[PDB]
Design a protein around this ligand. Structure first.
Ligand SMILES: [Ca+2]
Ligand SMILES: [Zn+2]
Ligand SMILES: [Zn+2]
Ligand SMILES: [Zn+2]
Ligand SMILES: [Zn+2]
Ligand SMILES: [Zn+2]
Ligand SMILES: [Zn+2]
Ligand SMILES: [Zn+2]
Ligand SMILES: [Zn+2]
Lengths: 490, 490, 490, 490
């Protein structure tokens, strides 16, 4: 992991760490712990606020050396913005600002005092869990496939969190591990993160934890199950597919929560080749997979007293002399025939089969997570995931979770009047809907396969990764899904 | 108006009209009026139902000639689908079917008995209102700019509506007149429907009704008001702009409802010329204007007890040697400067000045209606309007209205984390937000100008007209808007 | 005219000119005049044929200096190909070869003996006519808008044509003057060849010849005639339009032949701007006009005994703040309204009013000539003009003409089952028919306006000019057209 | 100017300013002034260096508060990189870093000691000049067309520069004023920076300085001079063109240096409209003009002993119903006719007339500066200007200048075997050379007009501005140009 975390009950002026992180608002008001430091230093902070050397606005950090009265030789004061605007987002931002300021340089250990602040509509435990997740996220560094490049080794390695809720720290660490796991898999280049590598990785995790389990299916096994839709998409690739099935037995004999994630390890588009631009971003097209796996890792580490099953169709969509074609009609596991209007709308073609397969687990709730559509990105941007369901209660449960940890989704409708967009002359249903309403129509396609299920669909195409060669997997929506499971476990 | 309407309370078998319109369900059960006719004819309908000659599935009709016992020489039986699934949609589809079946041919007068059928969660008044709007909508024929083309003379002219609520009929007739007005304006070629013409049509209507009032501004007048954003869009075109302001004073003393409709009479895209297809559909880019004007017409003819102001900026966005250019920084009426990233995002540039304008009226609710974004089409389809607001109560008022009359909208978020996409180095604000979230950031742009207002935004790009050379303006969202105002008048 | 012509009946060996032009075939056999020269030189040609110095294959020439016995200091021997395969094409290619070989250099005067060669299915008159047109065509040099560029002064100025039909020479010379006129007009940059200039050039020619007459209309005059389709195209451009009407009264009392030529002097595409390449070739979009004017010139100079009217709508199709826009509905002269699906299908919109106009002349045959469609190029290539008509007899008259002079056309059907592609909801007719059949539906469009007429349409888009920055106007189809009129005068 | 400058010779520890700026290297060694401060503070810096709190790697800074012994309450230590690798680039990056670090916040006055550091192959004068230009460059904030947007008030206003060459400071300050002028002009939106405005700004500057002179020509005047190429570009736009001619007579009797800057104030591409992206960056297409004007400002304020003439054709290239069209043949001032292959290759068409114009001044060197070609960007990047000339000595003068001040250029060949690419059938010259060699053939085009001249061409398309909505005009190549003129004044 990027950082290690402890809890800490010291007086801020006595803490034996390389640096104390405190806060100041835009009107120059000091966070409580900042006040303790101001006292110990006999008004040195107030003197610097007065002089305008310590800024309180959003994004400001100021690093001060050897305040008198303070055991730690450093104090970082982070701006918290306008006090009357303080809440969830300023708090998360403030915490990320602190870590980004300490990421490189002389500070190995710091004390995060910001957890003491009231965040409206949130408790002390939440303040701790978010301290861990946000600061761990901000310290992430990818190195798996550097060869000769040396990276910087200095800076923050351990963060002491002001507080004493051990359980909250533990759930925050477990979450951060899930997040990191998902971002590593997302980030790995497609020639390393193949379907085989993803299944092995997930299995080697399962196998270290008493009560976690993995079952990996291969193409022969999937053929025997009738997963013909999934197999059409996979056929072109020299990298052969896997069905990754992960179980956590924390809920005794209760029915399980079932997550189904799209694990297209790379998407060329197939014969409908991606020629418009951004084909390089397509290692992120397994983030639904990475993300439900990350959630499994968090759930298992936090020992959540629930039953969780995670299903990930791990498939590569390659162009090839034996690749499926547009206008092909393929037989899904459910027996429905699908007409492939476009081979690059193949996520839903591996998901439909996994969702059918998941019926065997008798899900309490069934939620698929997928980088499905450019349409959703047009609809909601990188900011927010698309959510679709025919069950209001489930939809609201997932919305509430996203809102709670600020990893937001927004519902889109599955109105009947959208359904005829998927009409076909040659098969039961057409896999695409036309120029308009594509996020919704992909959802409608999925829903053909989930009629007897309490089901929801997260389109995560915008939230899962950033654009450009410097962009990374964000780890979203591991935040939302882990919180959803915490809610189910409470 | 394409049809005449009357209420009619005659017994079905005695009605003296050219055709009686009755219903049958997919399971062979007959509407009450169908029964009366069956019984008057001593089981002829039941006989034709058995043999299979009268279908009751959705979208089917049967024209029967000279049933013994029935004064009307014809009976039209409309299929109602599974009695199980009856409700809003099947009801409306049936009215439309009935009119389509009679539109051309021997029938002039017909009695519509279908209003008798119970629609779950809708009253008798709604059955009547909807019977008039859907019939009239289906009867529409465009003729304004045909020349030598002989058009079809036969068919439905008068529809008697079974029932006995004269206020319901009057309101339906008022709404349908509004819808028709909006559709005629949207349908007219842009060489006829210039900004000047759109201003005259509306003023002329306003001048015929006591309590209604019109004021038309020209460019000198808008110059004097400082509407520099609006005038920048307008500059390149030979068809000079107008500001159309309509007032209805049916609410005495009360703060008014204010509708602001986008009246781009044609959109070349300007210097950012539309080169990628669809340019020929930009005669519908004034449908924002067409439909708030329609709603005005409906409010006036229905004599609703409210104050209603309707502001329509009317501008043609033309490419020319004096066209505003991308990277220009234009001064809006509010004094905010706008960097023009793209001349084709010009709707919002005429609305933002109209919105500032509209503030003079101290509105109870401020609602803009615009064919704003391709993004909203990708998001919501032709099916559903995009709705945006910072006031939940106002948003819910509009959603419930559209939902009542099946002229639907869906909310999209206006969260802060989207605002940054509108940053500018050379002006207060950039007029476009980049590739993703296009409908939202357009909504965000508008919000810069309505911060003090109880305001909502309706992106009507998908909903306002149909694609291709035979698609016409829909009249949407006059239905939503008028039902919204009816709720305020209740 | 680039060359001077005379008939010449001198014996080859005595002709006092700078070069005698003779033929040899691929099998070494000599043209009759070649023989005379061989014999005058006591077997020098035969000696140079044996050694292989005189090739007789297609496209080869040999310049020989000072053959004993021959008054002319030079002999040019042109290759004629296999005597087996001799005919129209090899004959013409040989004349062209001879001129190309002499175009630059020491030769001023030459005797062309090649006219002696028998061309299967062609008379001696055709050999002579063709010797003048092909030579002159090959001699053309464009100079009008060069400035500082020094041009090459040496080379052929005068061609003596072996033979003794003075009417044949006079007709060839007349045709070549017409061809040259058409090529100069087509070649001129569109800033020089505006509609105004094209009108003046033609009027000026008409005014020099008794029995010839010109009338030029301006926009007020066309306004008054109701040519609202034509004027809609014209509106956007600063170079104001003209209607050029030329009359030749060589047929006394008879109904006239009427040619209608498309005179688009430049085509930006208008609001439907040409963005996809080739815009720089739209100076050739008046070649319809150039070539009917050429044919006029030929008819007059040849003094053909027929009445000939030539109508040229002259319009620049410009993009501007007052340009007609797509979806406009414009009123044509015939009273039919036209929906403008695309401003770049504007040729037919100027022709359709010119065609209605032309009805006043009560024509014997009404033929339009236009660079109408890319579709026709895809259909027929640069090689061959598209021909369309509802009158077989007229179609055959034009095919036979083009076939006689190797200026070829090919018929395309105008069947009814194509007419539906031009439907419109907002007007009597839509101006474009969609993706397929583009040349046909353009032909169909025009036919709406010529129903009472013995009419044909010639799409000359491929045939009228050559691609790329050194390709020029061909002069085609002046050859076809003039031969057609010669047949009517016979 | 964004900052005030003074020389300052105070001992570092006694300087009464808000912040002293010192350097440390990646290996922990301290700049001389850093040492003085360390020593005044009895080893505080050395202590903070050991603990790792003061980084010396490239791009790092550290703000230290109230070091005992130092009058200034703050010390900023700037990282200098490996002492091994120190030189031009690390020196400049360090000055920029220092200003960026102080731009916003509590510091108003600071002493820049960094000028003390030896830069291999550069004198003390260059250290000072560069300290002023890089600091001022980094301090720039654009504000001209902000409206309601509140901007950040705190931060650096005055920079004291350690050292004692007042001529060096004065020249730096002069250059920075020129750079700023050029950047303001480039940055201004094209609706403010019209050709008229650009002419007034320059004339107004010229009129404030004795020995400086401005003359502005309008279209009638350019008409009279026969600048028909320039005026063809200009025709379509409502913003009428200007010829700006600035003279500085600091060299008495001598032949002048003449700079010709391309002043396209916006470029739509014209009829060859920019449809393929980037159109919004064409406000930078007058940077050729902006930067020769900047250089003028620098030459005048620095009072260089040379004659300097600066000619700027100022033209907006607009699409309109009177826009020149592709295939037009236009008559240049030199009398050469030009075939317009593409209206978007219009820069060279305004320069070629300005160049002919410029011949009146009998120049010692004639240098054009233009944002000419995308080709040059493909060739050289944003990093480096394309340089072209037929005179090696002049080329070397400019390369050495750019190399001295790190405002770099690179030569591209103007060989004859490239000239043929500009052939034309309809004019003396074609204005574009096809797909390859685009920067070279543009250079070749210009050369047709400067054959009698000691002339060079600088393609500044990559170098003049930064990409995207927050990229600004760089000011480049004012640095190169001014250093070039300094070398001529030496
Ligand atoms: Ca104009
Ligand atoms: Zn795909
Ligand atoms: Zn995919
Ligand atoms: Zn637009
Ligand atoms: Zn618009
Ligand atoms: Zn065209
Ligand atoms: Zn044309
Ligand atoms: Zn250009
Ligand atoms: Zn340019």
């Amino acid at each position: 992991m990027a950082l290690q975390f402890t809890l800490n009950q010291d007086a801020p002026a006595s803490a034996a760490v390389d640096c104390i992180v405190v806060g100041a608002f835009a009107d120059k008001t000091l966070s409580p712990a900042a006040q303790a430091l101001d006292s110990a230093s006999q008004g040195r902070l107030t003197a610097l606020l007065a002089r305008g050397d310590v800024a309180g606005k959003t994004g400001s950090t100021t690093l001060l050396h050897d305040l008198p009265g303070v055991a730690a030789p450093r104090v970082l004061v982070v701006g918290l913005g306008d006090a009357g605007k303080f809440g969830v987002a300023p708090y998360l931002k403030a915490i990320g600002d602190a870590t980004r300021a300490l990421k490189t340089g002389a500070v190995g250990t710091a004390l995060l005092t910001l957890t003491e602040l009231t965040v409206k509509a949130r408790d002390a435990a939440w303040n701790i869990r978010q301290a861990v997740t946000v600061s761990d996220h901000a310290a992430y560094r990818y190195t798996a496939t550097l060869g000769k490049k040396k990276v910087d080794e200095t800076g923050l390695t351990t963060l002491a969190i002001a507080g004493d809720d051990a359980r909250a720290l533990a759930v925050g660490v477990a979450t951060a591990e899930g997040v990191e796991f998902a971002r590593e898999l997302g980030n790995l280049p497609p020639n390393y993160c193949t379907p085989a590598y993803l299944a092995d990785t997930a299995a080697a995790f399962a196998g270290k934890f008493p009560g976690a389990e993995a079952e990996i299916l291969d193409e022969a096994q999937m053929e025997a199950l009738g997963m013909g839709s999934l197999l059409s998409v996979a056929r072109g690739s020299a990298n052969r597919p896997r069905l990754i099935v992960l179980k956590w037995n924390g809920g005794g004999d209760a029915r399980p929560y079932v997550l189904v994630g799209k694990g297209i390890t790379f998407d060329t588009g197939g014969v409908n080749l991606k020629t418009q631009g951004g084909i390089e971003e397509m290692k992120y097209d397994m983030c639904g997979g990475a993300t439900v796996i990350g959630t499994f890792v968090a759930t298992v580490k936090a020992e959540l007293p629930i039953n969780l099953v995670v299903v990930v169709p791990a498939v590569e969509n390659a162009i090839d002399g034996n690749a499926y074609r547009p206008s092909d009609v393929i037989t899904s596991m459910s027996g429905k025939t699908i007409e492939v209007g476009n081979t690059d709308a193949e996520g839903r073609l591996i998901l439909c089969d996994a969702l059918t397969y998941a019926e065997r687990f008798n899900p309490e709730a069934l939620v698929d997570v997928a980088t499905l559509t450019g349409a959703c990105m047009v609809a909601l941007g990188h900011q927010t995931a698309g959510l679709m369901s025919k069950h209001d209660d489930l939809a609201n449960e997932l919305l509430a979770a996203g809102e709670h940890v600020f990893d937001r989704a927004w519902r889109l409708p599955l109105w009947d009047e959208y359904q005829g967009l998927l009409d076909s002359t040659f098969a039961d249903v057409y896999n695409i809907g036309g120029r308009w309403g594509g996020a919704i129509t992909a959802g409608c396609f999925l829903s053909r396969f989930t009629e007897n299920q309490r089901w929801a669909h997260l389109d995560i195409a915008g939230v899962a990764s950033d654009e450009g060669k410097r962009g990374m997997a964000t780890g979203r929506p591991v935040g939302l899904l882990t919180q959803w499971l915490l809610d189910r476990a409470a």
